[PDB]
Amino acid sequence: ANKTVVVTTILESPYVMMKKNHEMLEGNERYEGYCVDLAAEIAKHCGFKYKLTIVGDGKYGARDADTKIWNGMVGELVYGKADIAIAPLTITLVREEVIDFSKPFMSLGISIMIKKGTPIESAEDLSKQTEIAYGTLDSGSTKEFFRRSKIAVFDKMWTYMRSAEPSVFVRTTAEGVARVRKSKGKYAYLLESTMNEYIEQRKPCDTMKVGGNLDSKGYGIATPKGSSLGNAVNLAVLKLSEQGLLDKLKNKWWYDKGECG
Amino acid sequence: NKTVVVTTILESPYVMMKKNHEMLEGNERYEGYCVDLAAEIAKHCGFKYKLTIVGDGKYGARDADTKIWNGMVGELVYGKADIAIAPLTITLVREEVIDFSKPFMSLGISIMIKKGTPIESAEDLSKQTEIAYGTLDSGSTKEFFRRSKIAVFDKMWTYMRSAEPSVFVRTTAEGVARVRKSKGKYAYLLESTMNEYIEQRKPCDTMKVGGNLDSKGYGIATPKGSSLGNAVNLAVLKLSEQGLLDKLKNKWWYDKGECGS
Numbered sequence: 001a002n003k004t005v006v007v008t009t010i011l012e013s014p015y016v017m018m019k020k021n022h023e024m025l026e027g028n029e030r031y032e033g034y035c036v037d038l039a040a041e042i043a044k045h046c047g048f049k050y051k052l053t054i055v056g057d058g059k060y061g062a063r064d065a066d067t068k069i070w071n072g073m074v075g076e077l078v079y080g081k082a083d084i085a086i087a088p089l090t091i092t093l094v095r096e097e098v099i100d101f102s103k104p105f106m107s108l109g110i111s112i113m114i115k116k117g118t119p120i121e122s123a124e125d126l127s128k129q130t131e132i133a134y135g136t137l138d139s140g141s142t143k144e145f146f147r148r149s150k151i152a153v154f155d156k157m158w159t160y161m162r163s164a165e166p167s168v169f170v171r172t173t174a175e176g177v178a179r180v181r182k183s184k185g186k187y188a189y190l191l192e193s194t195m196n197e198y199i200e201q202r203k204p205c206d207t208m209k210v211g212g213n214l215d216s217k218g219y220g221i222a223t224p225k226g227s228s229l230g231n232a233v234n235l236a237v238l239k240l241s242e243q244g245l246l247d248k249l250k251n252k253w254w255y256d257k258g259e260c261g
Numbered sequence: 262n263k264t265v266v267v268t269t270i271l272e273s274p275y276v277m278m279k280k281n282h283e284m285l286e287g288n289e290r291y292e293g294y295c296v297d298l299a300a301e302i303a304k305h306c307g308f309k310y311k312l313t314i315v316g317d318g319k320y321g322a323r324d325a326d327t328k329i330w331n332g333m334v335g336e337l338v339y340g341k342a343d344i345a346i347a348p349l350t351i352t353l354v355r356e357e358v359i360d361f362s363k364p365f366m367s368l369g370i371s372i373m374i375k376k377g378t379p380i381e382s383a384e385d386l387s388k389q390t391e392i393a394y395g396t397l398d399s400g401s402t403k404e405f406f407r408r409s410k411i412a413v414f415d416k417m418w419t420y421m422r423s424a425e426p427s428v429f430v431r432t433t434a435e436g437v438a439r440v441r442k443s444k445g446k447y448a449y450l451l452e453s454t455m456n457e458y459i460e461q462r463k464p465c466d467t468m469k470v471g472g473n474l475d476s477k478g479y480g481i482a483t484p485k486g487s488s489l490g491n492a493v494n495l496a497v498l499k500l501s502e503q504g505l506l507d508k509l510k511n512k513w514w515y516d517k518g519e520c521g522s
């Protein structure tokens with residue numbers, strides 16, 4: 001028995017990042033971040049050894065409408081490439097039907113990121129104007145939220161977003177962030193609040209979150225349907241939440257060493 | 262097949278008796294957030310149910326000597342109810358004996374004061390005595406404090422467990438009434454969700470002060486390994502994603518509110 005648990009995750013600040021001198025280190029030591037600290041804690045409390053591995057396609061997880069094949073981390077779990085996922089992977093209905101999620105370890109909601117000074121303070125504002133273009137991340141839960149909403153106003157935004165050109169979608173969060181920064185207030189980015197708040201406390205401190213969140217959910221630790229890790233992992237998340245560890249890690253990576261004062 | 266027995270608790274604004282309940286029968290006697298949620302869950306899972314108010318009026322705790330569970334948790338554990346649809350907090354000790362769906366509402370332990378009371382946080386309370394403070398018996402908030410190592414809370418616990426007259430109450434309505442009648446000499450520790458509701462109701466003399474002490478949520482509970490478990494979880498995710506949960510929240514907290522705004 002006793003096998004090293006394969007952990008799929010994704011390079012997304014400040015969840016998982018490459019260490020300054022990663023080239024001179026090996027294994028799990030090459031990485032640092034919120035999810036790296038949580039992984040160690042989860043493995044420690046569940047009593048298993050693990051190996052962190054970055055998803056090959058660098059995606060979170062979506063199902064191709066044609067081929068019906070899941071990509072990103074969800075795919076890793078569904079097709080047997082990984083035993084567990086420890087990343088900012090949002091708990092959703094479609095995913096929940098093919099994989100298991102522990103109770104959420106972090107909260108978030110879809111929010112709006114703008115370049116400071118951009119005349120926009122809500123989603124209503126974005127769906128009403130047109131000088132300012134907006135989009136989301138590809139293959140993520142935010143894009144799905146809009147494509148599946150039945151709430152008139154969000155459908156209105158979807159109607160615009162997926163027919164807009166040039167494309168308003170981006171491959172990575174960093175890509176969307178740069179687009180906001182280089183577009184002089186003519187591009188707003190729809191992303192999860194946790195990430196929005198993180199970038200907000202980072203140089204050059206030129207972005208900010210405006211308005212309230214569009215929804216409420218959280219990230220969960222995922223495992224293959226019917227896996228035997230699920231039970232213990234869930235109990236580990238509950239213990240860590242009640243002992244204050246999750247709150248501690250949140251401040252450590254978001255606010256403790258923020259650089260916008 | 263058989264009608265589902267639903268244990269819940271009389272707690273505003275989750276479950277309350279309609280002003281004309283005397284002339285009503287069955288589930289129609291009640292109204293509230295959880296009343297509406299149960300109707301939704303039942304419809305999406307395809308079952309008929311009977312709302313039953315928990316016998317002892319408690320949420321659920323374990324007697325340290327007999328190891329017997331009381332409240333809604335006991336109802337589930339001893340086979341008296343098939344499901345619990347109420348503002349029941351997801352906790353480690355409970356998860357060991359019953360199952361919880363994904364959270365359907367967020368909350369954190371908070372502080373309620375009579376408007377004008379000189380308290381801005383948990384520290385202000387911990388380091389003084391002219392103002393007494395307590396929690397609800399047989400609940401998760403009380404457990405939080407008796408298991409808190411975090412310096413300030415452990416200190417708050419030592420005071421609470423010994424103060425005379427008793428600082429604890431057996432219903433939220435009791436704790437709230439005591440706050441309103443003590444002239445700022447008593448502060449109450451309760452979940453933010455309930456604190457916020459009371460704050461919007463006349464006589465509009467109470468206040469939510471400081472930030473939350475922790476972060477968690479309520480979940481629909483079922484007996485371990487119960488059949489309903491899976492369907493109920495999928496329903497909560499669906500209700501959450503289609504905006505149904507957000508809709509009920511505004512309906513029962515802000516929509517109809519008495520303190521203006």
Ligand SMILES: NS(=O)(=O)c1cc2c(cc1Cl)N[C@H]([C@H]1C[C@H]3C=C[C@@H]1C3)NS2(=O)=O
Pocket residue numbers: 091092104107216217218363364365366367368478479497498501502506507510
């Ligand atoms: N804002 S709230 O308190 O009304 C609230 C809180 C929450 C909601 C939905 C609403 Cl509306 N959904 C999430 C649920 C959706 C999926 C992600 C976490 C669970 C499963 N739980 S939550 O984070 O506890």
Ligand SMILES: NS(=O)(=O)c1cc2c(cc1Cl)N[C@H]([C@H]1C[C@H]3C=C[C@@H]1C3)NS2(=O)=O
Pocket residue numbers: 103104105106107108217218219238241242246247248250351352364367476477478479
């Ligand atoms: N504040 S946070 O975003 O760092 C955060 C968010 C959450 C935490 C803990 C922290 Cl610290 N715990 C809860 C967990 C505790 C139990 C109640 C809901 C789950 C199970 N999930 S959560 O509501 O998503």
Ligand SMILES: N[C@@H](CCC(=O)O)C(=O)O
Pocket residue numbers: 060061088089090091137139140141142143190191192
């Ligand atoms: N956390 C999201 C990805 C980011 C986003 O969609 O904005 C997911 O799990 O799909």
Ligand SMILES: N[C@@H](CCC(=O)O)C(=O)O
Pocket residue numbers: 320321348349350351397399400401402403450451452
């Ligand atoms: N929601 C709590 C009861 C209220 C409280 O503890 O403040 C529970 O499930 O025990």
Ligand SMILES: [Zn+2]
Pocket residue numbers: 018022
């Ligand atoms: Zn490098």
Ligand SMILES: [Zn+2]
Pocket residue numbers: 041044045
């Ligand atoms: Zn630990």
Ligand SMILES: [Zn+2]
Pocket residue numbers: 121122125
């Ligand atoms: Zn406006």
Ligand SMILES: [Zn+2]
Pocket residue numbers: 301305505
């Ligand atoms: Zn419905």
Ligand SMILES: [Zn+2]
Pocket residue numbers: 415416418419
């Ligand atoms: Zn102590």
